Amino acid sequence: TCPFYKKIPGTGFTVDAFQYGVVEGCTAYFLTHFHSDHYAGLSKHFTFPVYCSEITGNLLKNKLHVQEQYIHPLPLDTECIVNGVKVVLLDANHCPGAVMILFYLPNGTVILHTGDFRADPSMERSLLADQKVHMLYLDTTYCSPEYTFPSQQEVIRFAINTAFEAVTLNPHALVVCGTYSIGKEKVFLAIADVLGSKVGMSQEKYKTLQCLNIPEINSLITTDMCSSLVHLLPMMQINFKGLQSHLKKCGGKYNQILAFRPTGWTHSNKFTRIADVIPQTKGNISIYGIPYSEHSSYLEMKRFVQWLKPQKIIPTVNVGTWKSRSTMEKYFREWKLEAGY
Ligand code: NI
């Protein structure tokens, strides 16, 4: 049974609600982005209308085999009428294809559903500037002040400078980057660009990247691993054992691995600056954990909400414990008292 925070009142709509069977009253199912916790339940046998971005609809057709007749892609930043209701899709600054959804209810209520997002001051100049929002369905993944991390641009600077130094010192070093979903593609594209290389990967991952509308992608990636000195592997293989096994397979081309694990936040963020980050090392293998986030930090989240001034907030993450729900409610009230709405 579908939980209340996935239903949009006064509509026939649900958001990210594919694992509940046939939801009573639902005439259109929205999907904010192609991450497994959100698409859970979709498959080639789904027979109701799915509304999403063009990039999400490419992934639905090629990776999940949803039939074409049920995929309804909408352009961004464009007023569209769905089943008699005005909607707008906005870029979420999450992974490729990820959107926020504005719903203009027939009674005059305006609802923003953020999906998963990394809030940014640029959103203060989208179509959100132009009218009031009554209800906010909010990605609260990092809603606590302990959750700090650097900008994406600082993290990519660190990765590029680290990889370029290592490979210039040792031209026989291989760089490996971990992945387990879409998102975070800048990590491996930025490193391969400084090295003058394509990124090498499995056929399965190449197929996924080919659905993302990245400019000039054919110039940037390949399935020919032998031609590439940046390799992608499953996140599970980014450990000393898995990396040793991979180095064996490269036929003595390489004598060292430098690997990256993009994570979200980790407790080593509560002590160490990005500049001071060091790897774990065993022999000729070194592994960096880098804090590349596609979700709002606490401060980014608080700025967005204090600018938007919603009348009511419904969290969509960390909703399963009383302690989490009470913590989030306290911060929402602080923010409103501080800003005066
Ligand atoms: Ni996500």
Q: How far is the CA of 278 from the centre of ligand 1 (A)?
A: 27
Question: For residue 120, how many other CB atoms are within 10 A of its CB?
Answer: 15
Question: Phi/psi of residue 125, each to 5°?
Answer: -120, 20
What CATH number labels 148-295? 3.40.50.12650
Where exactly are the structural domains of the chain?
Answer: 1-147+296-341, 148-295
Name the strand (E) or helix (H) holding 36: helix 36-39
Q: How was this structure determined?
A: X-ray
What CATH number labels 1-147+296-341? 3.60.15.10
* Secondary structure (3-state) at 292: coil
Determine contact, residues 56/34, Cβ cutoff 8 Å.
yes
Q: How far is the CA of 11 from the centre of ligand 1 (A)?
A: 24
Q: What is the DSSP string of 204-229?
A: HHHHHHTTS--TTGGGTEES-GGG-S
Residues comprising the chain, all counted: 341
* Secondary structure (3-state) at 302: helix
Q: How far is the CA of 113 from the centre of ligand 1 (A)?
A: 14
**DSSP bridge pairs for 129:** none
Q: How far is the CA of 95 from the centre of ligand 1 (A)?
A: 7
Q: How far is the CA of 33 from the centre of ligand 1 (A)?
A: 7
Q: How far is the CA of 109 from the centre of ligand 1 (A)?
A: 27
